[PDB]
Amino acid sequence: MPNYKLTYFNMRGRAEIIRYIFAYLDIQYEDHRIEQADWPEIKSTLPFGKIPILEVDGLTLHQSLAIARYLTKNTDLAGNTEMEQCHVDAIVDTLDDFMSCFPWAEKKQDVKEQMFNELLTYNAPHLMQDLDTYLGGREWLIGNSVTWADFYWEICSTTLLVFKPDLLDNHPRLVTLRKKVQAIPAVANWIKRRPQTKL
Amino acid sequence: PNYKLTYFNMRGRAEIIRYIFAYLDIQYEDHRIEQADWPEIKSTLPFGKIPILEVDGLTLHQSLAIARYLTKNTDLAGNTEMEQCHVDAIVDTLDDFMSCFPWAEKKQDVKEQMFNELLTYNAPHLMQDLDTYLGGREWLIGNSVTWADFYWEICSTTLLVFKPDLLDNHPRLVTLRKKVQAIPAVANWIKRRPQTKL
Ligand SMILES: CC(C)(O)[C@H]1CC[C@H](NC(=O)c2cnc3nc(C4CC4)ccc3c2)CC1
Ligand SMILES: CC(C)(O)[C@H]1CC[C@H](NC(=O)c2cnc3nc(C4CC4)ccc3c2)CC1
Ligand SMILES: N[C@@H](CCC(=O)N[C@@H](CS)C(=O)NCC(=O)O)C(=O)O
Ligand SMILES: N[C@@H](CCC(=O)N[C@@H](CS)C(=O)NCC(=O)O)C(=O)O
């Protein structure tokens, strides 16, 4: 048994993909959440001043997608062929690119509001349409079994729906995919048992 | 397999793939398009972006997903799962930074302001972080070159076009660039590639 400690804020955010992977693989870990009050303290110690980080047997890892890739290496979640592993990474990166456009840390309310609106109004539907086309009539995004891209799709879409509840109105196949992920017992169990935060 | 890489006539996000092909001695069609070609091609792509890599007629996208696919089971990947994690983290740290720049911005006033903002405040912190993380080592991860070293040299090249003094107080990061550039396969590609701003 290896010693895992996850450090992030109290919210889903960029740590959530790691938490889904831990739940799905049934791995016990310390889900260390922090208030903003403690943020400047810990920040000074961090290698690149960013969370989430994951401590593994006294060794520190950073970058949430780098960590998620490390944890799924050698598992069913990574993909069934070398090429399918690329597709998993590329779908994840495509989703992460779009989530990263949003100005999460913007101090000016009016600039943050205008940007969140532009992205959700013009960009988001282009992405939903491309994703819908990519999925087609298949059960999972890549190959014939669930991957951590399906986890990421579910996590990303959950946060987009908070700001734009009608996002998937004309995309029932993408809603089905969210339901299929949420129905995975280990994921269901995590969703039910997790702190209820907005983001 | 036969490889066809499609991107704009610039280093940009394709350059990491081009360094990996050079290093591994892999022949490939380096297909470069002008802006005028772009709308025609954009609709054929499942996610409407480039670069794309065609491997025996099958399309891959996302530059870093492709880089990770090409380097798997090679000396560029990182020797252990943990070191692979470090390689991914460094590349993601660098790529996060390069993504902040408003590459596609029309208004040159707000564009120059943000470029200078990022190069003034944010770039030196990242330089200091990288210099610390590198410590006593000659390469970013382990005891040999990885594609993270390539990516450093690629990202730093583009940053030095806008802020040539960025590595004045960081000679070990300069050394790292020169070590990447002294690799024969890389040196050879750098001498022969089309000379572009970006
Ligand atoms: C300390 C502070 C006030 O400066 C910080 C606190 C944390 C904030 N982060 C977010 O609000 C946030 C939330 N969800 C995200 N989800 C994603 C995608 C779905 C995985 C990506 C980035 C996200 C960023 C930024 C400001
Ligand atoms: C269609 C269009 C005309 O609107 C496009 C054309 C391509 C443009 N992209 C860039 O100029 C560009 C260039 N170098 C880059 N280098 C990086 C560094 C390596 C990681 C990241 C992003 C970059 C983006 C955006 C607008
Ligand atoms: N690409 C990185 C992004 C890390 C990141 O920027 N995280 C934010 C929280 S969502 C943070 O730590 N912000 C601190 C700051 O910039 O002051 C990842 O996915 O881990
Ligand atoms: N994270 C992606 C980004 C791809 C991307 O944004 N590419 C730009 C060119 S640098 C593009 O195709 N832009 C087309 C457009 O915005 O219309 C990658 O690394 O491949």
XYZ file of C-alpha atoms and ligand atoms in Angstrom:
489
model
C 0.000 0.000 0.000
C 1.411 3.449 -0.976
C 0.769 6.701 0.967
C -1.230 9.268 -1.049
C -2.049 12.839 0.052
C -3.949 15.195 -2.273
C -3.686 18.937 -1.547
C -6.162 21.321 -3.237
C -8.816 23.932 -2.322
C -12.226 22.890 -0.993
C -13.913 22.385 -4.394
C -14.052 19.963 -7.366
C -11.972 22.068 -9.815
C -8.718 20.644 -11.205
C -8.342 18.047 -8.376
C -11.627 16.265 -9.191
C -10.225 14.083 -12.028
C -7.673 12.739 -9.500
C -10.450 12.032 -6.960
C -12.536 10.144 -9.604
C -9.466 8.046 -10.523
C -8.843 7.247 -6.818
C -12.512 6.281 -6.296
C -12.651 4.161 -9.479
C -9.406 2.307 -8.661
C -10.492 1.979 -4.978
C -7.311 3.667 -3.654
C -7.260 5.195 -0.151
C -5.847 8.740 0.037
C -5.853 11.850 2.240
C -8.163 14.401 0.536
C -6.460 17.394 2.214
C -8.577 20.495 1.445
C -7.419 24.034 2.344
C -8.998 27.460 2.938
C -7.629 30.466 0.991
C -6.369 31.866 4.354
C -3.651 29.139 4.321
C -2.884 29.633 0.561
C 0.087 32.072 0.704
C 1.790 29.893 3.400
C 1.778 26.617 1.405
C 2.322 28.475 -1.923
C 5.849 29.574 -0.854
C 6.804 25.858 -0.411
C 5.300 24.624 -3.757
C 7.694 23.952 -6.678
C 5.789 26.179 -9.188
C 3.304 27.868 -6.787
C 0.275 25.883 -8.042
C -2.184 23.228 -6.804
C -3.263 20.509 -6.988
C -0.229 18.530 -5.814
C -0.010 14.852 -4.907
C 2.442 13.482 -2.363
C 3.406 9.851 -3.116
C 5.467 8.057 -0.416
C 7.143 11.409 0.502
C 7.683 12.524 -3.152
C 5.785 15.519 -4.621
C 3.961 15.560 -8.004
C 2.200 18.550 -9.630
C 0.011 19.337 -12.713
C -3.411 17.735 -12.439
C -3.400 16.027 -15.867
C 0.206 14.859 -15.374
C -0.889 13.270 -12.056
C -4.055 11.696 -13.568
C -1.935 10.206 -16.388
C 0.518 8.773 -13.820
C -2.301 7.141 -11.786
C -4.027 5.578 -14.847
C -0.815 4.259 -16.378
C -1.138 0.472 -16.600
C -4.939 0.591 -16.004
C -8.005 0.033 -18.216
C -8.725 3.803 -17.919
C -5.690 4.741 -20.119
C -7.001 3.169 -23.402
C -6.809 -0.229 -25.188
C -4.099 0.654 -27.839
C -1.158 3.116 -28.113
C -3.237 5.122 -30.666
C -6.321 5.036 -28.377
C -4.114 6.336 -25.504
C -3.239 9.313 -27.752
C -6.983 9.925 -28.418
C -7.647 9.842 -24.637
C -4.898 12.439 -24.060
C -6.119 14.572 -27.028
C -9.785 14.606 -25.893
C -8.624 15.514 -22.351
C -6.371 18.266 -23.721
C -9.181 19.592 -25.966
C -11.537 19.798 -22.941
C -8.811 21.281 -20.648
C -7.907 23.923 -23.289
C -11.510 25.136 -23.332
C -11.884 25.153 -19.503
C -8.564 27.075 -19.260
C -9.941 29.923 -21.475
C -12.287 30.981 -18.643
C -10.773 33.706 -16.391
C -11.290 31.880 -13.068
C -8.956 34.199 -11.083
C -10.086 37.518 -12.692
C -10.353 40.223 -9.984
C -12.607 42.530 -12.127
C -16.223 41.221 -12.002
C -17.303 42.969 -15.249
C -14.368 41.556 -17.313
C -14.897 38.051 -15.827
C -18.673 38.249 -16.595
C -18.298 39.369 -20.262
C -15.672 36.636 -20.954
C -17.667 33.798 -19.291
C -20.596 34.889 -21.444
C -18.737 35.095 -24.820
C -17.162 31.625 -24.359
C -20.469 30.007 -23.280
C -22.456 31.700 -26.098
C -20.219 31.200 -29.186
C -17.354 28.778 -28.348
C -19.058 26.185 -26.092
C -21.715 25.067 -28.687
C -18.969 24.586 -31.338
C -17.236 22.230 -28.844
C -20.440 20.343 -27.892
C -21.152 19.834 -31.643
C -17.586 18.590 -32.350
C -17.710 16.297 -29.278
C -21.170 14.969 -30.303
C -19.819 14.285 -33.832
C -16.702 12.611 -32.330
C -18.766 10.303 -30.065
C -21.222 9.389 -32.845
C -23.383 6.416 -31.745
C -20.609 4.791 -29.648
C -20.958 4.126 -25.890
C -17.707 5.785 -24.751
C -15.601 8.610 -26.202
C -12.617 6.314 -27.009
C -12.679 2.623 -27.898
C -15.290 0.294 -26.348
C -14.788 0.940 -22.604
C -14.741 3.848 -20.156
C -11.559 5.961 -19.989
C -10.505 8.927 -17.847
C -11.511 11.156 -20.834
C -15.094 10.068 -20.053
C -14.425 11.056 -16.413
C -13.040 14.422 -17.579
C -15.958 15.030 -19.943
C -18.343 14.451 -17.002
C -16.359 16.767 -14.648
C -15.936 19.560 -17.227
C -19.591 19.368 -18.355
C -20.769 19.434 -14.677
C -18.989 22.818 -14.217
C -20.219 24.240 -17.571
C -23.848 23.354 -16.655
C -23.606 25.515 -13.474
C -23.193 28.597 -15.768
C -25.176 27.398 -18.843
C -27.867 24.810 -17.875
C -29.144 24.553 -21.525
C -25.661 23.602 -22.926
C -26.636 19.965 -23.715
C -30.323 20.617 -24.688
C -29.647 19.626 -28.334
C -27.047 16.921 -27.358
C -28.805 13.989 -25.614
C -26.006 11.562 -26.631
C -23.557 13.696 -24.569
C -26.067 13.664 -21.670
C -26.284 9.850 -21.966
C -22.478 9.710 -21.691
C -22.596 11.832 -18.474
C -25.277 9.449 -17.053
C -23.209 6.321 -17.986
C -20.148 7.746 -16.140
C -22.248 8.770 -13.091
C -23.805 5.253 -12.987
C -20.365 3.580 -12.485
C -20.838 2.416 -8.831
C -17.423 3.611 -7.525
C -18.036 7.014 -9.210
C -21.684 7.122 -8.010
C -20.421 6.445 -4.448
C -17.905 9.321 -4.714
C -20.501 11.780 -6.196
C -22.961 11.023 -3.354
C -20.270 11.227 -0.593
C -18.405 14.420 -1.764
C -18.578 17.959 -0.310
C -21.253 19.993 -2.144
C -19.411 23.062 -3.531
C -20.430 25.262 -6.504
C -17.227 24.606 -8.520
C 4.606 3.935 -40.822
C 4.265 7.044 -43.030
C 3.788 10.344 -41.180
C 2.287 13.591 -42.471
C 2.356 16.622 -40.157
C 0.087 19.565 -40.985
C 0.516 23.036 -39.470
C 1.081 26.699 -40.420
C 4.514 27.729 -41.784
C 5.887 28.460 -38.320
C 7.547 26.683 -35.399
C 4.587 27.278 -33.030
C 2.830 24.188 -31.617
C 4.165 21.823 -34.273
C 7.837 22.398 -33.457
C 7.880 19.885 -30.576
C 6.727 17.162 -33.026
C 9.368 18.235 -35.582
C 12.170 18.007 -32.903
C 11.040 14.485 -31.942
C 10.991 13.261 -35.579
C 14.522 14.725 -36.153
C 15.904 13.170 -32.983
C 14.405 9.691 -33.643
C 15.511 9.873 -37.344
C 11.937 9.506 -38.596
C 11.129 10.625 -42.143
C 7.848 12.541 -42.422
C 6.067 15.003 -44.723
C 6.327 18.431 -43.073
C 3.173 19.884 -44.652
C 2.952 23.661 -44.078
C -0.116 25.763 -44.993
C -0.719 29.511 -45.455
C -3.622 31.271 -43.688
C -5.382 31.342 -47.133
C -5.500 27.474 -47.116
C -6.894 27.358 -43.524
C -10.742 27.678 -43.871
C -10.721 25.010 -46.654
C -8.856 22.569 -44.354
C -10.421 23.509 -40.979
C -13.799 21.820 -41.774
C -12.121 18.440 -42.529
C -10.603 18.324 -38.990
C -12.727 16.753 -36.206
C -11.816 19.559 -33.695
C -11.020 22.364 -36.183
C -7.404 22.869 -34.964
C -3.833 22.186 -35.997
C -1.344 20.668 -35.709
C -2.557 17.239 -36.829
C -0.412 14.170 -37.496
C -1.509 11.476 -39.968
C 0.016 8.027 -39.106
C -0.634 5.499 -41.914
C -3.720 7.543 -42.884
C -5.108 7.898 -39.316
C -5.471 11.423 -37.885
C -4.101 12.431 -34.442
C -4.556 15.917 -32.925
C -3.299 17.935 -29.869
C 0.445 18.675 -30.137
C 1.401 17.353 -26.672
C -0.793 14.229 -26.954
C 1.063 13.519 -30.255
C 4.466 14.247 -28.625
C 3.647 11.773 -25.837
C 2.510 9.152 -28.396
C 5.719 9.519 -30.488
C 8.107 9.364 -27.479
C 6.528 6.356 -25.739
C 9.018 3.447 -25.286
C 11.922 5.746 -26.368
C 14.803 7.404 -24.469
C 12.972 10.803 -24.732
C 10.022 9.621 -22.587
C 11.518 9.440 -19.071
C 12.917 6.148 -17.700
C 10.284 5.502 -14.964
C 6.552 6.190 -14.499
C 7.480 8.843 -11.895
C 9.929 10.549 -14.325
C 7.266 10.382 -17.065
C 5.015 12.266 -14.612
C 7.794 14.899 -14.166
C 8.210 15.201 -17.961
C 4.432 15.734 -18.376
C 4.317 18.260 -15.488
C 7.154 20.444 -16.828
C 5.704 20.461 -20.363
C 2.243 21.325 -18.947
C 3.780 24.141 -16.793
C 5.556 25.606 -19.862
C 2.458 25.112 -22.076
C 0.123 26.757 -19.560
C 2.401 29.815 -19.688
C 2.637 29.956 -23.532
C -1.197 29.549 -23.733
C -1.776 32.792 -21.697
C -0.453 34.884 -24.658
C -3.263 36.295 -26.857
C -1.846 34.847 -30.103
C -5.119 35.396 -32.055
C -5.933 38.946 -30.712
C -6.912 41.591 -33.330
C -6.378 44.841 -31.329
C -2.560 45.400 -31.158
C -2.917 47.842 -28.175
C -4.457 45.301 -25.725
C -2.241 42.563 -27.293
C 1.068 44.415 -26.625
C -0.145 45.375 -23.090
C -0.808 41.699 -22.165
C 2.437 40.441 -23.832
C 4.426 43.010 -21.777
C 2.342 42.215 -18.630
C 3.160 38.459 -19.027
C 6.836 39.004 -19.997
C 7.380 41.614 -17.201
C 5.700 40.101 -14.119
C 5.011 36.421 -14.833
C 7.963 35.285 -17.024
C 10.723 35.967 -14.426
C 8.900 33.922 -11.721
C 8.696 30.935 -14.117
C 12.386 31.395 -15.028
C 13.313 31.362 -11.292
C 11.141 28.259 -10.653
C 12.730 26.389 -13.608
C 16.250 27.358 -12.467
C 15.538 26.007 -8.950
C 13.897 22.790 -10.229
C 16.909 22.143 -12.501
C 19.378 22.450 -9.548
C 22.611 20.435 -9.993
C 21.360 18.543 -13.115
C 22.228 19.147 -16.786
C 18.696 18.069 -17.944
C 15.245 18.898 -16.553
C 14.398 15.244 -15.743
C 16.968 12.564 -14.845
C 20.429 12.094 -16.395
C 19.492 12.395 -20.078
C 17.541 14.521 -22.541
C 13.731 14.288 -22.624
C 11.112 15.943 -24.794
C 10.618 18.378 -21.821
C 14.117 19.738 -22.576
C 13.051 20.092 -26.242
C 9.914 21.948 -25.164
C 11.935 24.287 -22.915
C 14.197 25.176 -25.839
C 11.166 25.697 -28.150
C 9.184 27.858 -25.665
C 12.277 29.879 -24.601
C 13.149 30.551 -28.292
C 9.741 32.194 -28.848
C 9.908 34.158 -25.528
C 13.419 35.480 -26.451
C 11.977 37.012 -29.665
C 9.817 39.282 -27.434
C 12.161 39.684 -24.405
C 15.804 38.955 -25.364
C 17.127 39.684 -21.815
C 14.839 37.058 -20.134
C 17.713 34.664 -19.246
C 20.351 37.286 -18.215
C 20.319 36.094 -14.564
C 19.794 32.371 -15.446
C 22.902 30.960 -17.200
C 21.998 27.314 -16.397
C 18.774 27.764 -18.438
C 20.922 29.254 -21.246
C 23.193 26.185 -20.941
C 20.151 23.904 -21.204
C 19.139 25.612 -24.511
C 22.688 25.187 -25.884
C 22.779 21.488 -24.842
C 19.517 20.850 -26.737
C 20.903 22.788 -29.752
C 24.193 20.782 -29.715
C 22.320 17.461 -30.256
C 23.337 16.638 -33.892
C 19.822 15.666 -35.051
C 18.394 18.862 -33.483
C 21.260 21.135 -34.630
C 20.706 19.698 -38.107
C 16.950 20.423 -38.077
C 17.499 23.979 -36.669
C 19.995 24.753 -39.502
C 17.553 23.464 -42.171
C 14.080 24.533 -40.922
C 12.284 27.521 -42.520
C 13.249 30.693 -40.633
C 10.056 32.224 -39.130
C 9.220 34.714 -36.356
C 7.162 32.143 -34.397
C -6.708 31.820 -4.702
C -7.530 32.350 -5.866
C -8.684 33.203 -5.360
O -6.658 33.210 -6.621
C -7.999 31.225 -6.825
C -8.839 30.130 -6.150
C -9.175 28.992 -7.119
C -9.865 29.501 -8.378
N -10.085 28.411 -9.335
C -11.276 28.178 -9.902
O -12.265 28.855 -9.636
C -11.380 27.037 -10.867
C -12.454 26.161 -10.729
N -12.708 25.121 -11.493
C -11.846 24.883 -12.525
N -12.133 23.797 -13.300
C -11.322 23.527 -14.322
C -11.669 22.314 -15.158
C -12.907 21.508 -14.876
C -11.570 20.933 -14.575
C -10.201 24.291 -14.631
C -9.900 25.372 -13.863
C -10.730 25.707 -12.771
C -10.515 26.805 -11.909
C -9.058 30.610 -9.028
C -8.765 31.737 -8.044
C -6.112 31.102 -37.936
C -5.362 32.233 -37.252
C -4.738 33.158 -38.291
O -6.342 33.011 -36.539
C -4.321 31.708 -36.228
C -2.963 31.373 -36.851
C -1.997 30.769 -35.835
C -1.800 31.687 -34.642
N -0.916 31.072 -33.653
C 0.277 31.598 -33.340
O 0.699 32.612 -33.888
C 1.114 30.874 -32.329
C 2.486 30.791 -32.565
N 3.371 30.210 -31.782
C 2.900 29.624 -30.641
N 3.837 29.016 -29.862
C 3.439 28.435 -28.741
C 4.567 27.803 -27.960
C 5.189 26.518 -28.433
C 4.356 26.523 -27.206
C 2.114 28.406 -28.319
C 1.158 29.001 -29.093
C 1.533 29.635 -30.300
C 0.639 30.288 -31.178
C -3.134 32.050 -34.016
C -4.089 32.650 -35.046
N -2.589 23.230 -15.495
C -2.491 23.233 -14.028
C -3.126 24.506 -13.474
C -2.884 24.675 -11.983
C -3.530 25.945 -11.480
O -3.328 27.009 -12.051
N -4.304 25.826 -10.396
C -4.902 26.960 -9.712
C -6.192 26.542 -9.025
S -7.472 26.019 -10.195
C -3.947 27.560 -8.705
O -3.251 26.815 -8.023
N -3.884 28.889 -8.632
C -2.961 29.556 -7.739
C -2.443 30.880 -8.269
O -2.225 30.981 -9.495
O -2.230 31.788 -7.438
C -3.168 21.995 -13.466
O -4.112 21.489 -14.114
O -2.746 21.546 -12.376
N -3.534 22.769 -27.364
C -3.657 22.588 -28.814
C -3.960 23.953 -29.422
C -4.260 23.903 -30.909
C -4.529 25.300 -31.434
O -5.155 26.120 -30.766
N -4.037 25.562 -32.647
C -4.228 26.818 -33.349
C -2.962 27.188 -34.102
S -1.551 27.511 -33.015
C -5.353 26.728 -34.340
O -5.464 25.713 -35.013
N -6.171 27.775 -34.446
C -7.272 27.760 -35.390
C -8.411 28.695 -35.037
O -8.452 29.172 -33.879
O -9.254 28.920 -35.936
C -2.396 21.926 -29.354
O -1.343 21.985 -28.678
O -2.480 21.298 -30.427
